[PDB]
Structure 1
Amino acid sequence: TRCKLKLLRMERIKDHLLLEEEFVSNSEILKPFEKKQEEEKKQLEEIRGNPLSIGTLEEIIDDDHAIVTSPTMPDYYVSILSFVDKELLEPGCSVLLHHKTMSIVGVLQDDADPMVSVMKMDKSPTESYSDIGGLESQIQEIKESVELPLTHPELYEEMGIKPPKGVILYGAPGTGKTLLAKAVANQTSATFLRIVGSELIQKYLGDGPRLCRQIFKVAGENAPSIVFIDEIDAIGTKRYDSNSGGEREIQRTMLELLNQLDGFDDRGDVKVIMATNKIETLDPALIRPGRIDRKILFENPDLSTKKKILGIHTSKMNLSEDVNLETLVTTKDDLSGADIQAMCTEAGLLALRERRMQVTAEDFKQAKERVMKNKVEENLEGLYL
């Protein structure tokens, strides 16, 4: 009761106080608009107008001009104007152009895009280490590479060799590499960007690369950082049609990424996580073996590993008092944690069907039967017998 009362005390005074102070201040600001303010705001409206077209700043030409590229097909040679200068701008930033007569009249976007929103995240990851529990040895390759130079780059300097640089998560589906990427980045204490490489594919021209470029700019501000480009396999090498194409932009995007690996300065402070199904789902043209460092090879859980994984799942599962963990493990042979996840859910479905609260051991066998069903192999006793 009293633990409530104390929190109640603090939280009421801080919130309430603030509301009254905000409420008064909106009036105290607006009443005087004399002198500097009125003049400033007025000029800014006049130079501007309505509507304002989004633009992008490709480059600055050193004579108070710039080259800009519009969302309309044309591109344009414009003057730099207003309160926003070329010192205050930087290339690759989204800028406000006045519709009628193209000139930079301002900025309010400041390099905010619908791709920029998805990439952003400066908060800690959701999973912490061994949520993600187990593939411990796999973590004991990712952590080496990813956690350790950020934490102390010192170690490598005393060792006398270049730091690690990136990691390639590759190998078996269903081992959770898409989850694992999260687990590590929490432990280190760093900022975690996440972007899906499918959204760097565009049917518009020059847009593909702009989206790749935004990532490393952001990464450098919030350094140390771990950047997860989820599914570099999905840029892949694929083709939509070959009679109207779609397979040009794929290359230009892939290329823009290979360059900023090394080319965003030789640092292990701009780490990358590339998750891929296999390497031969990527463009075969590649950067050299040390530039990406260690390639992390996921393989099937062994007998011990899938006890761990199974155990995690079933704790969450309610009303299973007739299930014993070991016996599940005996009947099954080696399989992903993916299929354990499914078996546990299929076992709730069966027991819900029957209308019985309990979940049996017997129940689980029926679920094994369903998952294993179309994996059957009779050429096993074709060789053996």
Structure 2
Amino acid sequence: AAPYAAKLKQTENDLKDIEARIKEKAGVKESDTGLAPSHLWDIMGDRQRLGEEHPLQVARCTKIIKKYVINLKQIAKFVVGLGERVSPTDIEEGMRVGVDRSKYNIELPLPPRIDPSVTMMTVEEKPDVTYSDVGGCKDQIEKLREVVELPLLSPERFATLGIDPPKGILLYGPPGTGKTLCARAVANRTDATFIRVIGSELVQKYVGEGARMVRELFEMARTKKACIIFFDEIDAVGGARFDDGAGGDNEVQRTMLELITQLDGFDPRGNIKVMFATNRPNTLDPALLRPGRIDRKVEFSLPDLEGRANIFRIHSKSMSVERGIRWELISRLCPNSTGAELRSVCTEAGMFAIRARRKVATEKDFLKAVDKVISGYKKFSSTSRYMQYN
């Protein structure tokens, strides 16, 4: 033992001695973006960088007095005037403008409100779920195409009838049918700006903090033409009308009332299409599910025994399969199963092909696989309770 004890004392001192000298030397060693084109930029950008073009201390107008009154964002009020050649139409109420750094005078007006920025990170950039991805050829998928896609691609046909085109549509049902799987699909195909919100993103402790948000999001959607504002998971901020008399339901119900007064509006909505993906229409509020704002409402159904024979064609054609797997045969054996569980028979036959050491998933690995996932994921009803009615 003793010959090797004297070698455990070196291993301890030595691994840390090395370690400090190597990380300080390596450093970021002077790596700063720009690279090879920024040397030609140095000719152009040195005569402008010295100009006072910048800085313009950004301010914001509080009163046009038929001259102009700005309020700096430091709190100190000044009366300024026109610039080099700006039109007197540019200066509007509550608009930000840049003013000369020294003696204050409007040089260049600037777009409005610096509260938008928590609302530009909610906008996604063309999802990859395509439009044939969704199961069946149901008539319910064409109703999504008759409320959103069709009146914006051709407003010629809804102008001859005379009808106000239906603008809303509600997607509701049991989970696993794709409420978000068909709202991604429709964001790929329509090429209209999609604006996803999380309805449980608004909540904070400081009341009417989600009032600011809801306002500015609603304006940001008003400016771009053809938009779709997809509110997911509005069971929080979309609850029943009640009044506990003692809790903190008072913060919660602020953000809903502000959601109500913009939807209908003094100034109607201007080419905004409305989607709601809810789990339940059962607790949802009586002022949101009241029909001018919902228009036409299509509940997405549990696929029938023909709807699962259709769906089973999307997941078994992409796997490598021997020829002659009747898609009716595995759909029968299965009980009443969503399409999110009918996707998991392919994945459990794919993990059993690897165990059995097969390069092909066959009709034998799918018969076993059914038995395992139907038992397994059926047993134990999550909470196996729920209720909370009486």
TM-score for both structures, normalised by structure 2: 0.69
- Distance across 2 between alignment mates of 1:178 and 1:259: 26
Shift of 1:352: 2.8
Amino acid at match of 1:143: R
Amino acid at match of 1:288: R
Paired residue for 1:26, among 37, 41, 56?
Answer: 41
Counterpart for residue 170 of structure 1: 172
Deviations 1:116-149, CA, capped at 9 Å, x for gaps: 233224x444333212242531112111111122
Amino acid at match of 2:294: I
Counterpart for residue 129 of structure 1: 131
Paired residue for 1:111, among 85, 94, 114?
Answer: 114
Counterpart for residue 51 of structure 2: 38
1:1-385 equivalent positions in 2, closer than 5 A: 22-23=37-38, 25-33=40-48, 38-41=51-54, 44=56, 60-62=62-64, 79=77, 91=94, 111=114, 115-121=118-124, 123-134=125-136, 136-237=138-239, 246-263=248-265, 265-267=267-269, 269-286=271-288, 288-318=290-320, 323-373=325-375, 375=378
3-state SS of paired residue (2:282): helix
- Distance across 1 between alignment mates of 2:134 and 2:170: 18
Structure showing greater Rg: 2
Q: Percent identity?
A: 41
3-state SS of paired residue (1:195): strand
Is the contact between residue 334 and residue 374 of structure 2 (CA under 8 Å) also seen in structure 1?
no
Amino acid at match of 1:257: L
Counterpart for residue 6 of structure 1: none
- Distance across 2 between alignment mates of 1:264 and 1:371: 53
3-state SS of paired residue (1:118): coil
Shift of 1:67: 8.3
Distance 1:86-1:174 versus aligned 2 partners, 3 A rule = farther
Count residues in correspondence.
Answer: 328
Is the contact between residue 322 and residue 358 of structure 1 (CA under 8 Å) also seen in structure 2?
no
- Distance across 1 between alignment mates of 2:337 and 2:95: 47
- Distance across 2 between alignment mates of 1:66 and 1:287: 43
RMSD across aligned positions (CA): 4.2
Shift of 1:339: 0.8
Shift of 1:274: 0.9
Distance 1:125-1:269 versus aligned 2 partners, 3 A rule = farther
Distance 1:108-1:190 versus aligned 2 partners, 3 A rule = closer
Shift of 1:90: 6.3
Deviations 1:32-63, CA, capped at 9 Å, x for gaps: 359xx624436x4xx68xxxxxx9x8x93456
Shift of 1:236: 3.8
3-state SS of paired residue (1:215): helix
Shift of 1:302: 1.5
3-state SS of paired residue (2:231): strand
Amino acid at match of 1:79: K
Shift of 1:277: 1.2
- Distance across 1 between alignment mates of 2:53 and 2:332: 77
The range that moved more, 342-351 or 108-117, is 108-117
Is the contact between residue 234 and residue 278 of structure 2 (CA under 8 Å) also seen in structure 1?
yes
Name stretches of at least 5 consecutive residues in structure 2 with no aligned partner: 1-34, 99-108, 380-390
3-state SS of paired residue (2:354): helix
- Distance across 1 between alignment mates of 2:71 and 2:307: 58
- Distance across 1 between alignment mates of 2:337 and 2:325: 20
- Distance across 2 between alignment mates of 1:31 and 1:114: 31
